[PDB]
Symmetry: D2
Subunit: 116 residues, 4 copies
């Protein structure tokens, strides 16, 4: 589990359940190639996106579909998504947790990076 | 204005208007002595709390009554307030802006400290 | 485990290890009475502060000693501490996770509240 | 000024000065068309990006080059940038301030949307 995503709702104080998460990797030609995707569980976590073999060094993009989340709660939010773009594994393999904290007009994202 | 308070609402994307702010200074006996207070304006800002002459080095607390704000909006909040406690003018006099970003179950606070 | 505290360093992208956490409960006479204390583990978590029996409804204060943390890293931070003050268990027992995200001149705190 | 960008540094407690900001509008083919850009001022603010006449409804991206900022300071950052993507003027024309608070491993962004 080299890559995990954790998402929290700052309005309700609760994990964010069934939120779509897409991950992309920058290709040689500088386009984004689909890398992996999934939905958060009831703990607001998404595990198992990738493997140590698959998760090589590169620039990755994680886009969390915060708009669908807010809309399903009856709220028209400001952002289309929360996005995190980062260089991974450039000094060797690491483990990455991407945490996002969501409000209708604000979000924050944090990375927790550990050495396996 | 040595000390500036700016508050925003992360749910509505708006400044937080008319929220109470109390400033305390730590007294010798280690209790909080009320120092200054007011209400945020329509721009979410509270100016004129203190003066250069009055705002000496020491430890200060800024308490924002976030719970009354969420209560006015009909949204159940987690915190009783947001309080920011800091040592002032350690390296000399500066202009301080205490910014706070509010959500019902979360807040963040940031100090912007300039010349 | 009705009360857990989790603390992250936003400069280093890492859990915050050995940070002191004090919890107080407001007494009938409106003073703060020491309730519990501990230090974060290497996962930046502090478990076992209290029990369901002990953790009755009241107004609680969690103060995290962020100043000592930053100072031990050679940084002179803005805040004396990060504090969270909240009413607990007023609609029945809940489980509370208090997460704090720390930078030298900023912090955020979030509560995740679940129904056991 | 329909669109305002303000950036702060949570490590130093300061506005972030001279960081590059690029604004894009989503084109019909769904690629990002560069729209406006500049550098934040000494107050960390970028004004004058667009005008009322030019800033029509649509989907916009604001990209803040946070990685060059941390690089100038000698601090290893996590993100390549901070990017904020939003639908504009859904309910009509408004004044938008995109605020961002930066740390090496974390950022937050907030929209303040007024009359
Ligand atoms: N894991 C805990 C809850 C929890 C863990 C983390 I790690 C976390 O991380 C952040 C990220 C950002 I971005 C913030 O602004 C803040 I404050 C905390 C948050 I939130 C909540 C549990 O449910 O048991
Ligand atoms: N003057 C304008 C814009 C403004 C917003 C913030 I907000 C701010 O400070 C913060 C603090 C935190 I804490 C954040 O997470 C973020 I994102 C921005 C400052 I200086 C300026 C207004 O507020 O209308």
């Amino acid at each position: 589990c080299p890559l995990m995503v954790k998402v929290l709702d700052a309005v309700r104080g609760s994990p964010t359940i069934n939120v779509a998460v897409h991950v992309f990797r920058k290709a040689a030609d500088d386009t984004w190639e689909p890398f992996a995707s999934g939905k958060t569980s009831e703990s607001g976590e998404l595990h198992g996106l990738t493997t140590e073999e698959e998760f090589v060094e590169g620039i990755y993009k994680v886009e969390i579909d915060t708009k669908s989340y807010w809309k399903a709660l009856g709220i028209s939010p400001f952002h289309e998504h929360a996005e995190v773009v980062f260089t991974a594994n450039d000094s060797g393999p690491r483990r990455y947790t991407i945490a996002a904290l969501l409000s209708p007009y604000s979000y924050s994202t944090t990375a927790v990076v550990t050495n396996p």
